[PDB]
Curated annotation (Swiss-Prot), chain C:
<feature type="short sequence motif" description="DDXXD 1">
    <location>
        <begin position="104"/>
        <end position="108"/>
    </location>
</feature>
<feature type="short sequence motif" description="NSE/DTE">
    <location>
        <begin position="237"/>
        <end position="245"/>
    </location>
</feature>
<feature type="region of interest" description="Terpene cyclase">
    <location>
        <begin position="1"/>
        <end position="337"/>
    </location>
</feature>
<comment type="function">
    <text>Bifunctional sesterterpene synthase that possesses both prenyl transferase and terpene cyclase activity, converting isopentenyl diphosphate and dimethylallyl diphosphate into geranylfarnesyl diphosphate (GFPP) and further converting GFPP into sesterbrasiliatriene.</text>
</comment>
<feature type="binding site">
    <location>
        <position position="104"/>
    </location>
    <ligand>
        <name>substrate</name>
    </ligand>
</feature>
<feature type="binding site">
    <location>
        <begin position="333"/>
        <end position="334"/>
    </location>
    <ligand>
        <name>substrate</name>
    </ligand>
</feature>
<comment type="similarity">
    <text>In the N-terminal section; belongs to the terpene synthase family.</text>
</comment>
<feature type="binding site">
    <location>
        <position position="108"/>
    </location>
    <ligand>
        <name>Mg(2+) 2</name>
    </ligand>
</feature>
<feature type="binding site">
    <location>
        <position position="104"/>
    </location>
    <ligand>
        <name>Mg(2+) 2</name>
    </ligand>
</feature>
<feature type="binding site">
    <location>
        <position position="108"/>
    </location>
    <ligand>
        <name>Mg(2+) 1</name>
    </ligand>
</feature>
<protein>
    <recommendedName>
        <fullName>Sesterbrasiliatriene synthase PbSS</fullName>
    </recommendedName>
</protein>
<comment type="subunit">
    <text>Hexamer.</text>
</comment>
<comment type="similarity">
    <text>In the C-terminal section; belongs to the FPP/GGPP synthase family.</text>
</comment>
<feature type="binding site">
    <location>
        <position position="104"/>
    </location>
    <ligand>
        <name>Mg(2+) 1</name>
    </ligand>
</feature>
<feature type="binding site">
    <location>
        <position position="108"/>
    </location>
    <ligand>
        <name>substrate</name>
    </ligand>
</feature>
<feature type="binding site">
    <location>
        <begin position="241"/>
        <end position="245"/>
    </location>
    <ligand>
        <name>substrate</name>
    </ligand>
</feature>
<feature type="binding site">
    <location>
        <begin position="192"/>
        <end position="195"/>
    </location>
    <ligand>
        <name>substrate</name>
    </ligand>
</feature>
Length: 346, 346, 337
């Protein structure tokens, strides 16, 4: 490990400090925590009430308004995901992440037709801040909400926020193609475009205040993408149970994105079998971005731009670590209101 | 846009040429102003006294009533611009009696409300059959002279008006946390819009088969719905105040209170929803009217229907402007403020 | 900067909601319109026809009976000046005010000899209501009217009426002194406040609103009230100068013109623009003194019946000045081409 660089807003941490410990954490990357956990959790509690108004307003006949976001019983998605987030950017960071969670929740379980309708309505807002034209307002209350947030982000760092908004619109395109369910190698390629990892990294950039040519960021992708692949397969491992229940409960199994699904269906593996295969791809990826890190850190310049690039890879590594630990116990994936193992082996 | 037909007793007027200009008018429907505003205002002042007499007679151990007159015009003159000039007297009585009766029935308890409802219905049934079963309350006792007056002018039209009045009595005899969808069903039936239409029918002398009037109800009703919501919007402040100092806060049902309770909308978030719903309604009666004119032939059947529809549109037009500045709603003697009505946000 | 208490007969307004808009309004105190303008303008349209018949009775020579009173194209002096005037007192409140106007007209432009004649005469009708014995009646038809009027007033409320009448006679005493205008600005402001009728206006407001407050309690707030009334007089001098100059020229009484603008121009050689600017400043100073003084009084005030009346008293005045100002900014009495 030995993450180079100074940390001004976080402290090194361990699963050991948390109790009760998570049932199945097996990450190999380190992670930290912001000193700003309670502010983040306070913001996630207000944004929920917010979001739930918007959701009720688009569909007043549905009553389940249960959404699982950043706050868990041990900590918070933001505090672990982006430990070096700037204190006055914690708030807006929490809104982005949580909105990302909720928006995902009401778009990746519906029929590709209901998804297209909503995906378009969002892109209107985002494109509104990238072009010189006049604004186009979204029609769904769940997307209207996003406008005031994009202004906040851009008022903190416009250069950073414009680019994060760019890769957000890239995520939108990625999850609009999620209409069928593919080989394994064809799935790993589809899932990196659909998970929101590229957008996740740029939310870190804006969060941390990192200014860095797209060239330099690409100059390290070859291994950083292996790390990012790891986090996706990691998400599939932890979010598979709840995702089954949901796509079964909704009649969308058709479009269900998860490597357990792929490994257990095409290939005839079992849940345990596919799980075992996944645990090891996750290791491989975790190990390649970490290794890619040191390899980079020892043949490198002492330039101002070199120091920033290290800051950007440390931000990525730390984020996979923190979300790995977050994912291991988060309500969003480990809810006891869920289908079973025998039920999903069918 | 275009209202078809000739006008004989009224002139078109701009929310603009009025002085003092109302604070908050946003109606999208046209309205006219009778040329006999003066006459109506005189009747209102005389009927005020008669009502006061009756109301002191009926409760000698206890107020103010805010009827049709405003600093800028008169309810009847706007609500019923084309009222036949010799029917303004009795129309002004009808409306003012409606305004006052509502005050002494929608603020008391179900027990009291029922008794007064009961006693007034005795007066209506009497002229709708049989032996006259006369009213015992001084406040209800006064509609008798009124009714003979109405039927003397026009028996066929006054009876139908009388039928729908009774229907309104049935209306306002019925929940708090119902759904806005369920609230609009109830409120349309309890706001007396159908009665209001038939008062206009009597006023203008409209002879139109019941089956003909129902033919266009599918779009007329959406403008009436708009009007009840528009009423809700202007009367929420005074209505909250009244029920506050009575104890009867749960007694009140109002589109804003329901939006503020169902969803956790603030009053300001609710007035904005209500406004768009009011516009949706105003637009709808107008698009229905246009559709109907595109199909309707040039006979007499069609001439009368056109007057009826144009009558309703103008009625909604004028009451909105009336409603935007009448002391009944914007009286400046409330002990409660925006801060107090924020407490119902849940 | 918010007046407390409940408003029963009036609605807030301001210049923005008015059209056509007055060209030269610079008021800083708030104002309201009564809901009973219809009544007010009806009594005005009737009183006028009944006052020119007494003036023509008094002078059958008299040519023009033009008298610009309480009605304007945007409102009415009473609806604005006395917004909370009890509904059944609006009629009589209008008689009192139009009479005050028309009587001003036929006495404050003639020579002083003619003015005492008319003043001493009306004084007979007042005094006769302030005494229990000696009842003298007026001999002029213009003054004969006030008999029945004072009857209506005293019938609606004796205690308020009587005080109003004292201050009325007090107004007659004051304008009986405006014989010259060779004074300093200091001299003028003290003489004018005594002769502009503001004190009587306040009591007309007390009777119209039915305020029951002791004279000792009204004096605890004179120190700031009076700076508002002074301002209200300079405001009148400001808007009513052009028409006054005109008539005093007309009447050959150019040395009786009571007007701070005149005194700034003639005795200090300011120019209109200069003198108007000076006036606008003094008005704001007064306008702010009453409002600051009331704010400061309200904050240390307790809730007793006596203090709610005092609050009513001060608010009425503040609204009265605010209301009369908007009125003076467009009324025919001063803007009539
Ligand atoms: C919409 C995508 N996402 C990715 C985790 C929900 C699955 C939101 C999100 C983006 C970036 C960081 C955190 C959450
Ligand atoms: C406007 C509705 N209102 C007001 C008091 C009570 C429901 C009676 C009314 C109905 C129809 C015409 C005029 C008045
Ligand atoms: C001179 C008296 N005044 C007012 C200043 C006419 C100019 C009559 C009046 C008295 C009280 C209130 C309103 C008018
Ligand atoms: Mg999902
Ligand atoms: Mg998804
Ligand atoms: Mg998943
Ligand atoms: Mg009602
Ligand atoms: Mg009511
Ligand atoms: Mg209402
Ligand atoms: Mg004068
Ligand atoms: Mg004078
Ligand atoms: Mg003057």
């Amino acid at each position: 490990d030995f993450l180079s660089g100074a940390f001004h807003y976080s402290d090194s941490v361990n699963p050991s400090k948390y109790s009760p410990r998570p049932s199945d954490y097996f990450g190999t990357l380190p992670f930290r925590t912001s000193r700003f956990e309670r502010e983040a959790a306070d913001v996630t509690a207000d944004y929920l009430r917010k979001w739930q108004k918007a959701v009720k307003a688009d569909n007043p006949e549905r009553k389940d308004l249960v959404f699982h976001g950043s706050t868990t019983t041990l900590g918070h998605f933001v505090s672990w995901a982006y430990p070096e987030c700037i204190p006055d950017r914690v708030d807006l960071c929490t809104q982005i992440c949580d909105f990302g969670f909720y928006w995902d929740d009401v778009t990746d379980s519906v029929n590709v037709q209901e998804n297209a309708e909503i995906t378009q309505d969002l892109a209107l807002a985002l494109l509104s801040e990238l072009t010189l034209g006049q604004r186009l307002e979204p029609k769904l209350e769940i997307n209207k909400i996003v406008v005031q947030m994009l202004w906040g982000v851009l008022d903190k760092d416009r250069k950073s926020g414009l680019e994060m908004i760019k890769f957000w619109k890239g995520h939108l395109d990625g999850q609009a193609e999620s209409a069928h369910n593919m080989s394994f190698e064809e799935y790993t390629k589809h899932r990196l475009s659909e998970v929101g990892a590229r957008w996740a990294v740029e939310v870190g950039c804006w969060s941390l205040g990192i200014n860095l040519s797209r060239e330099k960021k690409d100059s390290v992708a070859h291994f950083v993408n292996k790390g990012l692949l790891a986090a996706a397969l990691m998400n599939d491992y932890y979010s598979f149970n709840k995702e089954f229940d949901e796509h079964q409960r909704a009649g969308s199994m058709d479009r269900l994105q998860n490597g357990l699904g792929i490994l257990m269906r095409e290939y005839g593996y079992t849940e345990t079998e596919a799980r075992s295969i996944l645990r090891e791809e996750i290791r491989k990826g975790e190990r390649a971005i970490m290794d890619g890190y040191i390899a980079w850190r020892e043949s490198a310049d002492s330039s101002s731009e070199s120091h920033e690039l290290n800051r950007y890879i440390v931000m990525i590594i730390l984020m996979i670590g923190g979300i790995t630990f977050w994912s291991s116990h988060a309500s969003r994936y480990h809810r006891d209101d869920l289908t079973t193992a025998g039920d999903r082996a069918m």
